[PDB]
């Protein structure tokens, strides 16, 4: 509620808030589903409510606001161990496309568009164990929106058949991600 970065929980709902240091940002967790992050010529940071654990078949619900000035993603976020997995689907974005750089496997269709499927990796990066090689996987929304739901099951299933495994799910979150920018959201989680 202007909280420094952590993990905890605020009323069924988990939240974690991480950032690299760098000043800008200003994260508060309002009552039940809902939080607001503010920033202004942030560093990399990562906000965001949910679950701990996370499951391969909740549909998540979102609405709010996401204004980003830059680079800045909106996404269902979260983890897996062994193998260790950041994965992203992301709702929408700003000017940076999370893309750039990636290898396109595929697509799936879910919750009203198509996605496309990408895996990244990477190498020696804060990962949920502390520094870690692993594997990105995401799904991209090729039409962007800032509320709706989502049905994780769609996604998880289509990243299996391209060969994308998961192993046990650590937190899921709807995040904001920001990356040197600046940007406003007010999002509820349910």
């Keep these: 509620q202007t909280i420094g970065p952590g993990t905890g929980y605020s009323n069924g709902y988990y939240y974690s808030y991480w950032n690299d240091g760098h000043a800008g940002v200003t994260y508060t ?21 949910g679950w701990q654990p996370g499951t391969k078949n909740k549909v998540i619900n979102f609405s709010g606001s996401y204004n980003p000035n830059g680079n800045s993603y909106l996404s269902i976020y979260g983890w897996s161990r062994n193998p260790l997995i950041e994965y992203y689907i992301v709702e929408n974005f700003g000017t940076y496309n999370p893309s ?16 496309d499927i990408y895996r990244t990796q990477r190498v020696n990066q804060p990962s949920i164990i502390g520094t870690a090689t692993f594997y990105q996987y995401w799904s991209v929304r090729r039409n962007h929106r800032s509320s709706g739901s989502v049905n994780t099951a769609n996604h998880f299933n289509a990243w299996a058949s391209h060969g994308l495994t998961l192993g046990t799910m650590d937190y899921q979150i709807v995040a904001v991600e920001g990356y040197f920018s600046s940007g406003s959201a007010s999002i509820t989680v349910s």
């Design 100 to 115: 750039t750089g990636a290898t396109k496997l595929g697509e799936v269709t879910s919750d009203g568009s198509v996605y």
């Design 29 to 49: 967790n309002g009552g039940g589903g809902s939080f607001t992050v503010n920033w202004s010529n942030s560093g990399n940071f990562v906000a965001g409510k």
